[PDB]
Write a protein that binds this ligand. Structure first.
Ligand SMILES: [Mg+2]
Ligand SMILES: [Mg+2]
Ligand SMILES: [Mg+2]
Ligand SMILES: [Mg+2]
Ligand SMILES: [Mg+2]
Ligand SMILES: [Mg+2]
Ligand SMILES: [Mg+2]
Ligand SMILES: [Mg+2]
Ligand SMILES: [Mg+2]
Ligand SMILES: [Mg+2]
Ligand SMILES: [Mg+2]
Ligand SMILES: [Mg+2]
Ligand SMILES: [Mg+2]
Ligand SMILES: [Mg+2]
Ligand SMILES: [Mg+2]
Ligand SMILES: [Mg+2]
Ligand SMILES: [Mg+2]
Ligand SMILES: [Mg+2]
Ligand SMILES: [Mg+2]
Lengths: 129, 218, 88
RNA sequence: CGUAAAGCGCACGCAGGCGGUUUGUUAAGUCAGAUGUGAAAUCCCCGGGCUCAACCUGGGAACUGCAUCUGAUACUGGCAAGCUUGAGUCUCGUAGAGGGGGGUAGAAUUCCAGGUGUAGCGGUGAAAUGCGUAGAGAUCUGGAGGAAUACCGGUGGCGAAGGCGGCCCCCUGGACGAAGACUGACGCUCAGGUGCGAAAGCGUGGGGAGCAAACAGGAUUAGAUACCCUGGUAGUCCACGCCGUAAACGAUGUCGACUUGGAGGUUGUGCCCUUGAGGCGUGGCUUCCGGAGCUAACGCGUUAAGUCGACCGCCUGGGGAGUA
């Protein structure tokens, strides 16, 4: 029963790439907009909106390039049934460093590559190949 | 721009889910293909046809469904390229090297009947030879003058003549074609939306093709 | 079963006004009233296990609603349960 | 974990696990820093010494740990105040073999009594046992009983599953739709537990037409303790208990999200001209075919066996054995 909204976001994007849908519309949340902000800034998603009032239905705009969708893969890691909190150096690189891994830290939600500069780590949210 | 006649789409309920961009709903319980998206498509496709025609590349105009075959044969012999209006023998491209001797056979035999052995063996034999001749003349006649491999395989349909597409798609051959609502724009590159079962439609598209290719020899 | 008028009365006794109907106390009241009205139907028949099952459903429903109510506010909870006639 | 071993038969549900959204706080987890410790050897690295090596050995790193201390505060947890999209209650209806209790009707089989009437009837592959001039079978009338409900009836409906069909009343459960109203995360799952659970069976008291284990006879057969025939008891039926199992099977746990189509079925409602047995929409349940993808393959395919999440159950070669 909708136990994990984040994994739901990731899977909306995943099925949105498989079906090659344009926009993906989902209920919003602070963490939602943070993660979508990370993916956006990194370039996985072309823009987004948090259009909505009392029920913010934020929609993402999926990216494509040649024929294949941009998102190679996007597995949820720190699931609610198994939280994962990597140490600073312990922070994993995805695809030898050419694929960011969204990690939540005390300074906010950010890429692991940035958390290597921030000198600190935290809960790793999701690998984005 | 609707240049002349009617060719909006047709079929009915069983539209291929892949062609969502190019469909609408007619009150006659049948889809009408958009012309707005269609115009740049066949425009640019004809442009490519002119570019490869200047490249002096061999083209194949594939056709079937009886009434369309005539339009096809007319659009090649009136032009200069090649055509397969009748039965499209499986593996005539990716298996082309045996078809090659099939053609050698056609040519040498049609030569044999026109001056050589016209009845030498038996009257019955002459009958059989004329028969088989006509068979190979209408089976692989349009590709007789080739001897190489087509630079482009323009097809009169997609979903019906699927094997031509899948075959010519196995190698470096562009395969732009006029496709109907139920057709798959998968193996096809430059898709050209528009109805297909109508004769005016195939005469229109194929004729435009005749123009653009006819400019390639200049 | 429980008549529509019965509910019309019960609401105007466990809520704000006739307009309201969704509050916890009202729901619990309803559940209990219905259950009590059903006690009879199972005095006989007894083999009626499907109806029975509907009952069990509304019963556990009631225990959940009551549990919530308690955790939310033990005060008025004690009032409700002391009035509705239950508890061990 | 559909078919190879493997989803409990189904449900309810305590502890446990997990949990929508906004704000505040706290800082438990988490993270950063610092200090203390983490015996020596051993392992690793760079040197040194035995003629080399083994071995010895100096320094270093390592000892993935633990604890206190000052910070961070995104994410999770606790406490606080909330929000409405989850869940729930209310209002109006709709369909239904949902269930329990009480009635009731028609066709038929069997039995019983009598009429008419006459030698076969019955059965099978054939036949015999069986019934029959003590008058059967056929036939008509009157009666008595028990059981199941042709037609409708449909991959149609309802139920959690088992399962439920003549019609009628009585008590009663759940599902769905419409426009709202209100509650404010009350949710999901669930070991142990509790309930329900075909048939057969068991107990007690009834009932007993048909049917039919056991049994008997006749055949068939090398034999036939079976198949087939003639009989026929328990049982099948009712009341109340017990049993607790099925290939309890979409061989497919439950809940939630997402992801192209087509033809249907069934049941609501909105809309349009009912302007003519229609047209365009929106929900629920359900059958078949198929796309991407998945799959060992077969196949599944928006009621997934796809893409994910939560929780539970179970599997770890065949046999012994689901036995002691
Ligand atoms: Mg198995
Ligand atoms: Mg099951
Ligand atoms: Mg709990
Ligand atoms: Mg939360
Ligand atoms: Mg702390
Ligand atoms: Mg040491
Ligand atoms: Mg040395
Ligand atoms: Mg050191
Ligand atoms: Mg907090
Ligand atoms: Mg908090
Ligand atoms: Mg309200
Ligand atoms: Mg259990
Ligand atoms: Mg029984
Ligand atoms: Mg008995
Ligand atoms: Mg029992
Ligand atoms: Mg079993
Ligand atoms: Mg099973
Ligand atoms: Mg299928
Ligand atoms: Mg045993």
């Amino acid at each position: 029963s909708m136990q994990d909204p984040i994994a739901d976001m990731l899977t909306r994007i995943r099925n949105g790439q498989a079906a090659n849908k344009a926009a993906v519309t989902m209920p919003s949340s602070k963490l939602k907009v943070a993660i979508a902000n990370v993916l956006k800034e990194e370039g996985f998603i072309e823009d987004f909106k948090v259009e909505g009032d009392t029920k913010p239905e934020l929609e993402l705009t999926l990216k494509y390039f040649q024929g294949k969708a941009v998102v190679e893969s996007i597995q949820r890691v720190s699931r609610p049934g198994l939280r994962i909190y990597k140490r600073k150096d312990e922070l994993p690189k995805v695809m030898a460093g050419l694929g960011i891994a969204v990690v939540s830290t005390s300074k906010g939600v950010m890429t692991d590559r940035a958390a290597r500069q921030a000198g600190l780590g935290g809960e790793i949210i999701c690998y984005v190949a | 721009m609707l240049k002349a006649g009617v060719h909006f789409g047709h079929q009915t309920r069983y539209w291929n889910p892949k062609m969502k961009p190019f469909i609408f709903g007619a009150r006659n319980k049948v889809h009408i293909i958009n012309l707005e998206k269609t115009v740049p498509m066949f425009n640019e496709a004809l442009a490519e046809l002119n570019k490869i025609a200047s490249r002096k590349g061999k083209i194949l105009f594939v056709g079937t469904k009886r009434a369309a075959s005539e339009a096809v044969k007319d659009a090649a012999l009136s032009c200069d390229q090649f055509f397969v209006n009748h039965r499209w023998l499986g593996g005539m491209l990716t298996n082309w090297k045996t078809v090659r001797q099939s053609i050698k056979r056609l040519k040498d035999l049609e030569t044999q009947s026109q001056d050589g052995t016209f009845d030498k063996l038996t009257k019955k034999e002459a009958l059989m030879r004329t028969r088989e001749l006509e068979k190979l003349e209408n089976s692989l006649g349009g590709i007789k003058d080739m001897g190489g491999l087509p630079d482009a395989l323009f097809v009169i349909d997609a979903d019906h003549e699927h094997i031509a597409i899948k075959e010519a798609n196995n190698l470096g051959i562009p395969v732009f074609a006029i496709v109907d609502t139920n057709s798959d724009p998968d193996g096809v590159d430059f898709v050209i939306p528009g109805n297909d079962d109508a004769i005016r439609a195939v005469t229109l598209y194929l004729g435009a093709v005749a123009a653009t290719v006819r400019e390639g020899r200049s | 079963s429980l008549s529509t008028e019965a509910t019309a009365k019960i609401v105007s006794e466990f809520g704000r006004d006739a307009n309201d109907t969704g509050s916890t106390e009202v729901q619990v009241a309803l559940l209990t009233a219905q259950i009590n009205h059903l006690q009879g139907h199972f005095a006989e028949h007894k083999k009626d296990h499907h109806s029975r099952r509907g009952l069990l459903r509304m019963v556990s429903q009631r225990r959940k609603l009551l549990d919530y109510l308690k955790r939310k506010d033990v005060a008025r909870y004690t009032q409700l349960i002391e009035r509705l006639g239950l508890r061990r």
